[PDB]
């Protein structure tokens, strides 16, 4: 038995093509495989993770199934949890690889956050787009009632707000405090998001648990520019 080199103990998404080649040679020795042909897996580790098991079998009639299993065993068991983390951290390529390997696009943590909530909150537009294209629940509430549109409106991510609306986000969804996305955009001073929400049917007269409209919130915060938009339309 041979120990795997230290840089190959990194997750395979980080492996170069030369790293892949070293891993193959390590496996040839560790598992007593038929000699591996040097031109056979001419790609980096990110690409390797997108091959199917059938692809491995075709590429290596003698060892490809074994190599596929070895590679998959390197990955953590809970890909849905990894997807939540990758989406939160903006790891767009990792998001794509994890969903290709079966991660649930609607993976949910103990706060009710989904990948879409986390990518929306942290401004990761490309990840929002890939999640939506692959069936992400656009109107899922988290435990406090926050939808992805709430999360993008509160955090000032205008393009994400627009994409969520184009994919069916509920413009007048309520969180557990009765806040709509319009309330949260007003609370955090995002004037352009307020305009987009109104153009998509946001209810200026919606009252939260405190009896307050988005306009009331703009007055409490002294944000006269936001109050002006809201006043015009109600
Ligand atoms: Cl999953
Ligand atoms: Na590379
Ligand atoms: Na290298
Ligand atoms: Na090949
Ligand atoms: Na696969
Ligand atoms: Na290994
Ligand atoms: Na999983
Ligand atoms: Na889940
Ligand atoms: Na940001």
Author numbering: 2 to 235
From the paper:
Unlike the rigid linker constructs, this construct lacked a 10xHis tag. The first involved van der Waals contacts between side chains of the host DARPin and various side chains of a neighbouring DARPin, mediated by acetate ions. From the structure, we noted that many crystal contacts consisted of side-chain carboxylic acids hydrogen bonding each other. Numerous acetates were also visible in the electron density. This increase in pH likely began deprotonating the carboxylic acid side chains, causing them to repel each other and disrupt the corresponding crystal contacts, resulting in rapid crystal dissolution.
TELSAM is a pH-dependent, polymer-forming protein crystallization chaperone which, when covalently fused to a protein of interest, forms a stable, well-ordered crystal lattice. Target proteins can be genetically fused to TELSAM, which promotes crystallization by ordering many copies of the target protein along ordered TELSAM polymers, which associate to form the crystal. To address these challenges, we designed multiple constructs with several types of linkers—rigid (helical fusion), semi-flexible (Pro-Alan), and flexible (poly-Gly)—of varying lengths to fuse a designed ankyrin repeat protein (DARPin) to the TELSAM C-terminus.
